[PDB]
A paper describes a structure:
We determined the structures for CgDHQDWT with the citrate at a resolution of 1.80Å and CgDHQDR19A with DHQ complexed forms at a resolution of 2.00 Å, respectively. The DHQ-bound structure of CgDHQD explained the substrate-binding mode of the enzyme. Moreover, the neighboring residues L13, G77, G78, T80, and P105 organize the substrate-surrounding environment of the active site. There are six residues that directly participate in enzyme catalysis, including R19, Y24, N12, E99, H101, and R108. The Y24 positions toward the 2-carbon of DHQ to function as a general base catalyst with R19 and R108 activators. The position of the water molecule is known to be crucial, and it mediates the initial electron transfer from Y24 to N12. H101 and E99 give a proton to the leaving 1-hydroxyl group of DHQ.
Here, we report two the crystal structures of type II DHQD (CgDHQD) derived from Corynebacterium glutamicum, which is a widely used industrial platform organism. The enzyme forms a homododecamer consisting of four trimers with three interfacial active sites. Our analysis revealed that the monomer is composed of repetitive α/β domains, forming a flavodoxin fold with central parallel β sheets arranged in a specific order.
Numbering used by the authors:
A (entry chain C), D (entry chain B), G (entry chain C), I (entry chain B): 2 to 144
B (entry chain D), C (entry chain E), J (entry chain D), L (entry chain E): 3 to 145
E (entry chain A), F (entry chain A): 2 to 146
H (entry chain F), K (entry chain F): 3 to 143
The structure:
């Protein structure tokens, strides 16, 4: 039945190898498994996608319009730079939860700005991969 | 195992104050939800709400070494109080910052949080469910 | 018909503190002038001054639904307190901001007011007569 | 025989027709009548002028030097843009009360700044046309 | 049917003589003729005014309230400076198209801010005097819809 | 004679479905049809491309260098963010008209900045899809002169 | 023969009466006399105009195009606010010297900005009325 | 001859809080040091620490006309309270500002002090010895 | 057998044709040949890639992790806008030399900022295509 | 009566350095012109040019009480040196600041002058004639 | 045991320059005060004042490894010289920054110090007594 | 054919000062490396290091018209000296800016260079090898 769009942006494929002091030793496979297990608890399915390509994420949002209950998004660095990604989230009309493994507000000033936070129903930061589980919980209860 | 639940100024008005922004749940609903989630991990909650910054700072000092972590919604003090950030550091409690609303979608002066500099995680816009996720983070860090 | 009159920190020192800026009138004079003006309109005033922000916040909360409006001189909190603006909003009282001095003629840090965002009216530099006009605004809104 | 200069800047001739949700349904004729009635209570006269030309207000201020007890001015949009009008108020040496029908601090950021507030003895905003009655009362008592 | 208010602000009277490398060699009379001819294609008339005096522009906006279908405005330097002129456009209640002969966003930073852009339904910049023809076309079609 | 490059950036494929209170109920196909019909009035043709992929827009600009008389571009959100897209317009050497359906200067502050505006000969904003028709008219007349 | 356009903007008519601590006790008549005497030394004439009206100054610049050797301008407060005045100076094509009786850079921050300095051949500030004499000297030698 | 010694929020935690920044000395140590320096000049010290800004403001109001001066470590209120500045001005007390750490070597939000606008002197980074220097300044004024 | 990743970002395929007054008449093929010849002098190989797609450079950086001695990157306009590319360089763990044909600091202000300079071991600007020869020399000696 | 003429760094290159900006006159031409003008008022000039800030500061200290004023073109030190402003204040010389070019028409970093805070007058863009006007100001202040 | 005492540009004019701000004490007074405080702790003071930044930099370079610390009043260089900061770092000397006035109560351009980033301690507004406190800080380090 | 090699303040301390940032090479090593590289191209180097800005300025002036170019590491003057940029411009030498460290990776005050506005090339973070590349740029421009 209900489907959640799980979108991971640039560099998320490198989770577990990239800056482990900041992002931890968990993998993207762990993220998808955790979100899928949480959704299954609520009778929902997860359609997951990761890409270093902003255009692929936008295409995914457009394609999910009208057919998914919501979106869990970790835009990566696009969080602080893409108005196009924000416009895509708005075009999707999907209730969207923004997730960050790290706490961007405890990092460089350029990470303190998120175009997505303008459209997101909720923002979860610094909870590690557990943020994805909470994000699924939010969407399952909005629905 | 004990979690300190701290709600700052105006949170006693939850359910009455600006319901289009903060919703129709109450501070009692917040405390009962954090309590129910803490019980799933075999923990208890010590809850305090105050309109007085000094009472929150005294509560953080008093919890040092005796609590496993702090769930804090500093309210307006989020954006203004260095003294509260120094109190969180002095407590040495792992701290999750919660906001009912999404401050990044509101006025520019709400985009700045002193507490986000020290918090292990920040949850915004999830309504009262944010407090449930914050207990989950603290129970799993301690674990 | 009751007007909440709130004076913030340091206003107890009116007549002694910086008399070249604030003049020689006292807080007693302020309360008496506001009381006499309210009486002309069949109204009473409940007055409170405090060096504690939490006491002002508690007063706004306690006056919700029972008072016709608030006259507030926030003192130095004018420039610093988001929590006090949130309390004015939680109170749902039509609020007149009063400053004895003209803050726009003083240091740059006094040019910004959180309360001015939510106030129905702002009166500055009329001395203690500003409290008389503030009562007249609230009595006529009530009419 | 004591005389007050009442100045209304650009667009105030449209009072009652322009943006009634912001400025109300009263007219410029109502404003002048209200100021005149208040002045008469104190044995004072009001010389009123409105113009869509900044130069006309400056001329009026110069011509009033030494012959008027004070000035009540609503500069309109000139409030946020004219250093020339500020210099004129100072050249006049007239005690000046700045009046705004609306509360500019509750509006767009460009309206939060006033050159005239730097020289005004008092600033009244958001009291509707009653602000002009309070302004006359201030001048009659300074005198 | 109906009348469009065409307003040109300070210095536009100097069109063809002032900084021709930036503003071109056409005159203000060419602008008015072009706007009038475009309006005529839609059975509309144009009341044109230019002034170095901001108050005259404000008076023209006040006087046009309720009797014109819209306003085409090139505020000149007042674009970047006048809150009073924005308040006058709001008081007019006229649907307004802002026109610039040059492309202000390709010029000095102080030209990158427009008060009028906050109220205008459309902004046309850098089309030379042809921007006034497009502005009449927008107002003719808003009115028709 | 000649061909105009019409480029639409990210999200424009969603025209008619995305935020219709801001962008209207016309489709991207209506935009292309309108531009093509205007071009035909001048004996010109239009090569139209839309993509959510910035690289595709850059490739289209590179490929159009020397063979097209000009470019009409609605960069979408890339307007506010992409230096790479400005560098591509410069590399194209095409006279460029920037078009926005909405009036970005009446929206959020982050929409008030355009890299493309630094290179465009003209900028048209808030005319709905009619801005693309005016943009073809500008390019048809620059080419004629 | 050669003619210099001397333009004095808003408030300059008040020279000698306005803020004498800042602007001195000399009059506008003194300014015109001094400039006229200096020009006469070089076989030149001065066409002087003062107005509180920006439109009058712009009209004067347009009218002087092609018939004057240059312009001496004290724009008053328009110095820090008018792009229209700058555009007019450029349209005039007149070599222009900007003159300030006071030193604006030793005053409020808003006086530190001049649109005219962008077009002026020279800027003279703080020399009192003597600045006008120097300005005539510059234009007589450019010519 | 009496000096008002005011310590702001969190200073009660001196010795336990962020010892790599504030050291291992305690508030008791600060009060003893200031009291001994004051006694060398025949002066006494009325000391108060509070996490409650209103209490510090009341203390300043009550010391008006009775004290030779004030030594103040406002804590985080240093960067946030106009009210505390207004209180210092209302006190009319010559005031020395003291910081155990050097705020200018820390986060930008700590580079701003409202009290520094009114203080006769500002001492930073000298640890608890700053309080001894501050007493010396008020004694020689 | 030691391998250097040579990355050229958007528009660099147009080298020799685009803005020749700024970037010169040399081509991308010249750049790759120059880097390759320099690498061969040190017994090293160069794997070169250019793309108008940010995602392709990110993919290339990820794929090169652990298998290359370093990276020479000219990000093009991505230099001033992509946090994702910076995160990618860090994920790669490759010593990276940033190269600009032009001197961006001598150009528009928006070109004065580089995200890549935050992670690069070295930055070479304005040496034309010789910058790529110097970059290879840096990597060959760090190695 | 003696005037101190101080020229800062690079002014020895006048006539060679950036002639499109500074013209074709020399530092010798500057000194001879100031000398000729000082002689019309019965004064002498002591001229020093140095590329060393310390030598200018020593010259200001040494002129204290013995000179009637200072004509200074600080060169690049205009925009950067607080030490030079403190030296001008320590000298107690009435000081006229001269610039050959118009800094307000150049790069933003040239729009700031520490010396303009202390100077009685500032002359910019008049070429070497500025020095002549500066001597005239000093001769008439002393008079 | 030797302390390097460095005074920057204009400090030679102490007593004559802006006496309403800097007081009537002289540079000779500052050096004597610091020297006497140093002698109380069995230490000596090598003092230098200069209007030439290069001389101050050379002094810091030459004191590397030979001095217990540095007391510095950089004058206007405080708000302008990265070179002087680089010199302090090159010296490796524990450094106390001293200001006779309180720069935070003055013009905004005086609110910024490059030296405050490297200094162990900053003392402002105590007049020439700041130098005595600075010697005390280095002696107890 | 002669290259002016200028090293600014503190560079005499290379190898002792902050070795974790600048490394263990000495100023002698810098001069010897630059000298050997120049010799390969039939060129010589005239080297100067000073803790005095005026000495560097004098050197640039003295090298005008006789040297083929300048290699400059301005030290802390990079971030602070307008007078040094004006000297580079007065010299008319094609100039390469060299930094041993990568200033973009360090404190914000080190991110700004006056010399970078005028330099033909900027090389940062290559250690002392940056001086070798700088000589190679100047020799090939000369070719
Ligand atoms: O790519 C990432 C990861 C991130 O989104 C996170 O999950 O923490 C935070 C971003 O700032 C960063 O660019
Ligand atoms: O008091 C509150 C409530 C809040 O903390 C929240 O929960 O959303 C957000 C704050 O900005 C505000 O001042
Ligand atoms: O405490 C006060 C009094 C005040 O609010 C007034 O009444 O003028 C002005 C405030 O700036 C100041 O901090
Ligand atoms: O013209 C007006 C009217 C106004 O002064 C008022 O009365 O509220 C407020 C101004 O911001 C505006 O430009
Ligand atoms: O006066 C004008 C003309 C203008 O409005 C235009 O038409 O291009 C642009 C304005 O910036 C300038 O001040
Ligand atoms: O994508 C779009 C559409 C737009 O370019 C327009 O056509 O109005 C305006 C942009 O700000 C926005 O990001
Ligand atoms: O009106 C004046 C006079 C003035 O131009 C002068 O002559 O000093 C300076 C201006 O700042 C001021 O607004
Ligand atoms: O509370 C404190 C302690 C402090 O005042 C000090 O003593 O160093 C410094 C402040 O920045 C901080 O908030
Ligand atoms: O694409 C490029 C080329 C460039 O990186 C260079 O090589 O100089 C400089 C960048 O600013 C520009 O966007
Ligand atoms: O050195 C100079 C010359 C100068 O002072 C002038 O005379 O125009 C202007 C300064 O900005 C520049 O640094
Ligand atoms: O030269 C000095 C003296 C000073 O350092 C002091 O001692 O107070 C303060 C500095 O701001 C000023 O430039
Ligand atoms: O003195 C130096 C050395 C330096 O120029 C370098 O070589 O890296 C970098 C500068 O920031 C610093 O002040």
């Amino acid at each position: 039945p209900g489907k959640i769009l799980l979108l991971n942006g640039p560099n998320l494929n490198m989770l577990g190898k990239a800056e482990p002091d900041i992002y931890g030793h968990d993998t993207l496979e762990d993220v998808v498994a955790l979100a899928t297990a949480e959704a299954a608890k609520h009778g929902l399915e997860v359609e997951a996608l990761q890409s270093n390509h902003e255009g692929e994420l936008i295409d995914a949002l457009h394609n999910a319009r009208g057919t998914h209950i919501g979106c869990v998004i970790n835009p990566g660095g696009l969080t602080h730079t893409s108005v196009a990604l924000l416009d895509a989230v708005k075009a999707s009309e999907l209730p969207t939860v923004e997730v960050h493994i790290s706490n961007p507000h405890a990092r460089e000033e350029f990470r303190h700005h998120s175009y997505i936070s303008l459209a997101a129903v909720s923002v979860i930061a610094g909870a590690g991969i557990q943020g994805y589980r909470f994000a699924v919980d939010i969407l399952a209860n909005l629905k």
